[PDB]
Amino acid sequence: HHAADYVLYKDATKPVEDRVADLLGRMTLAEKIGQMTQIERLVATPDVLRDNFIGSLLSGGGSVPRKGATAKEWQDMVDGFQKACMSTRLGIPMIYGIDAVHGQNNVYGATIFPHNVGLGATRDPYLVKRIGEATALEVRATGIQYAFAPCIAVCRDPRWGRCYESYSEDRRIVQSMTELIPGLQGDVPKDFTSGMPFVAGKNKVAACAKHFVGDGGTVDGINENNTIINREGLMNIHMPAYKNAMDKGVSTVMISYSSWNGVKMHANQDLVTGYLKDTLKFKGFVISDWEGIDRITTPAGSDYSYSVKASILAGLDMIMVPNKYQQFISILTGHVNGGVIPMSRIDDAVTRILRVKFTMGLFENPYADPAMAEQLGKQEHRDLAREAARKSLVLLKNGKTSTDAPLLPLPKKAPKILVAGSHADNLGYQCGGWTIEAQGDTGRTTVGTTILEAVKAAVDPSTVVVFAENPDAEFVKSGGFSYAIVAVGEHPYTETKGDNLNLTIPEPGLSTVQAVCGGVRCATVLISGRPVVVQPLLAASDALVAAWLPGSEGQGVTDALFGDFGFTGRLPRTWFKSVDQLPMNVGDAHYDPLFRLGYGLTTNAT
Numbered sequence: 208h209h210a211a212d213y214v215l216y217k218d219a220t221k222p223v224e225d226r227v228a229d230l231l232g233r234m235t236l237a238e239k240i241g242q243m244t245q246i247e248r249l250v251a252t253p254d255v256l257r258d259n260f261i262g263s264l265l266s267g268g269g270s271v272p273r274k275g276a277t278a279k280e281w282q283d284m285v286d287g288f289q290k291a292c293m294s295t296r297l298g299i300p301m302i303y304g305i306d307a308v309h310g311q312n313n314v315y316g317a318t319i320f321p322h323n324v325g326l327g328a329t330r331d332p333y334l335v336k337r338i339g340e341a342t343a344l345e346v347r348a349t350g351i352q353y354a355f356a357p358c359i360a361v362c363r364d365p366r367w368g369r370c371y372e373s374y375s376e377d378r379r380i381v382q383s384m385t386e387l388i389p390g391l392q393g394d395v396p397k398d399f400t401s402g403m404p405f406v407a408g409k410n411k412v413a414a415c416a417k418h419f420v421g422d423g424g425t426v427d428g429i430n431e432n433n434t435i436i437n438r439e440g441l442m443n444i445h446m447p448a449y450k451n452a453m454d455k456g457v458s459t460v461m462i463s464y465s466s467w468n469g470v471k472m473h474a475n476q477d478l479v480t481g482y483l484k485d486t487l488k489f490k491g492f493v494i495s496d497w498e499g500i501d502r503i504t505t506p507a508g509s510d511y512s513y514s515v516k517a518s519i520l521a522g523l524d525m526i527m528v529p530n531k532y533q534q535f536i537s538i539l540t541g542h543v544n545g546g547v548i549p550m551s552r553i554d555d556a557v558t559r560i561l562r563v564k565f566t567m568g569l570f571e572n573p574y575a576d577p578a579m580a581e582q583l584g585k586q587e588h589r590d591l592a593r594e595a596a597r598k599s600l601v602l603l604k605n606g607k608t609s610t611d612a613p614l615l616p617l618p619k620k621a622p623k624i625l626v627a628g629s630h631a632d633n634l635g636y637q638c639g640g641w642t643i644e645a646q647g648d649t650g651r652t653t654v655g656t657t658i659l660e661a662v663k664a665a666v667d668p669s670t671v672v673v674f675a676e677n678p679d680a681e682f683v684k685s686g687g688f689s690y691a692i693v694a695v696g697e698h699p700y701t702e703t704k705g706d707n708l709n710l711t712i713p714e715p716g717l718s719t720v721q722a723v724c725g726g727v728r729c730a731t732v733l734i735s736g737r738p739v740v741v742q743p744l745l746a747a748s749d750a751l752v753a754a755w756l757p758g759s760e761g762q763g764v765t766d767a768l769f770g771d772f773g774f775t776g777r778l779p780r781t782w783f784k785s786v787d788q789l790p791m792n793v794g795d796a797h798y799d800p801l802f803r804l805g806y807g808l809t810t811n812a813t
């Protein structure tokens with residue numbers, strides 16, 4: 208169509224499939240393998256990106272241009288990488304990915320939304336869609352086009368260090384929360400074919416349904432371990448939400464470190480090619496997890512030639528290397544040159560990668576939009592996170608006896624009140640993992656409102672608010688307090704570091720609740736990624752709230768505590784009596800919960 212130097216793949220008016228085929232047909236082997244290679248920004252330079260025709264970059268947890276970097280600093284970094292990629296012979300733009308799993312959470316000043324388990328407690332898929340929409344904007348504020356979300360694991364054992372990244376042990380709730388996808392990506396057209404990738408344009412991001420499949424079913428909640436279950440169970444529990452993701456046009460799927468009945472997912476041709484691609488008709492691209500192909504072998508990385516062969520033959524399209532790109536490209540190149548991996552497999556991988564890039568508009572808008580920078584931490588997004596935090600809270604107790612006056616909602620006007628506990632004034636603890644760093648961190652790590660700051664912002668001006676992190680019983684008894692709010696719970700974690708067989712919160716936690724509640728009526732706010740041993744905390748407390756990991760907007764907690772809104776959250780997980788019961792999920796033959804899935808007391812707004 209027209210000009211003398213006309214190149215069909217560069218024509219924005221052409222059908223995506225025609226552009227894919229036109230570009231694919233021009234590519235060298237090095238250009239093709241390049242597209243299949245994703246590298247860490249930490250090993251990227253302009254020459255590396257050009258010389259190896261690199262297809263993608265990512266930031267791993269905490270991989271940031273610097274501490275406290277502005278949105279514009281992120282845009283300038285991503286654009287610098289993109290300029291190198293656009294300078295190659297074919298000018299194929301890279302796609303930049305990041306774990307934006309509860310907001311754009313690596314980024315200083317990004318809105319931090321509640322983690323997925325709390326979102327499950329809301330039973331509000333439209334809320335989650337809106338969170339997807341806000342997250343896409345904050346990711347694009349930083350120049351990034353791809354989010355490694357949603358985690359649609361169905362966590363079947365809360366001893367797993369990623370249980371907080373699962374919306375529920377009930378696959379029906381997880382399925383419902385796949386609305387994150389059209390939030391992040393845009394709603395698909397009316398005519399849409401299930402399994403096709405979709406992103407609306409430059410103000411949306413590619414999403415990633417992860418981790419395929421059965422990541423939430425591992426033995427004893429051991430991260431990256433074995434999921435031992437028959438096909439009927441895999442398909443009944445762990446698979447369904449992937450079909451919902453296909454119906455909603457999820458652009459990518461990431462493979463799990465875990466195994467299914469002893470077969471590494473990263474090597475499972477039957478499930479990746481036979482099921483995901485050939486049965487669900489997935490037409491986006493399949494990405495590895497971080498050194499996921501390395502971990503096919505024991506020890507990991509001990510036969511990388513086999514790792515490349517097994518993963519690429521299984522049907523993976525893009526490999527999150529993420530560091531040793533030279534070894535990966537060299538080995539894959541050798542496998543193709545030796546006929547071990549057919550060109551048909553390379554061409555399929557590249558077809559899918561290009562399909563996503565063309566579909567999302569990346570060839571038309573390869574660079575960041577500086578006008579989007581102000582989306583980062585934008586107050587409307589924080590108001591949304593605040594709504595979400597509030598809706599996530601599950602009221603487990605509100606009065607020690609049925610004769611007692613309900614403690615909650617608390618009055619905003621009282622002469623003097625106490626705020627206490629390790630988690631009352633700690634923004635990092637209330638955000639949990641995947642906040643600034645992978646494992647999270649302690650203290651004021653980003654912009655937000657702690658529980659203490661939220662209480663001070665909510666109460667009548669005549670109300671004196673005292674903070675004591677770990678007061679003794681005498682301090683409380685002598686203080687003249689009307690009531691106390693005491694916040695305790697889990698420290699931030701992710702992945703294997705969070706695997707935990709005991710599920711008891713660290714001390715001082717219980718001792719502080721006991722000291723405070725022994726002296727004055729108390730509302731205990733439990734900050735956790737999962738159910739934890741709770742009977743001792745309940746016994747001490749007048750009221751107790753499961754607040755999960757509510758994120759940067761602590762005023763979501765006080766909105767409910769002080770009756771601006773009624774409590775509405777319902778447990779999205781079984782609360783066990785003892786870890787000896789685990790695994791124990793709703794619908795099990797022997798089901799003896801402390802609180803069943805769906806439990807939640809309510810209050811009315813005052």
Ligand SMILES: CO[C@@H]1O[C@H](CO)[C@@H](O)[C@H](O)[C@H]1S[C@@H]1O[C@H](CO)[C@@H](O)[C@H](O)[C@H]1O
Pocket residue numbers: 266267268306355417496497645702
């Ligand atoms: C950021 O990657 C994590 O960090 C540690 C240390 O660098 C690695 O050893 C972990 O295996 C990965 S876990 C993996 O990270 C992906 C990219 O960040 C993420 O999308 C996925 O959900 C994780 O399983």
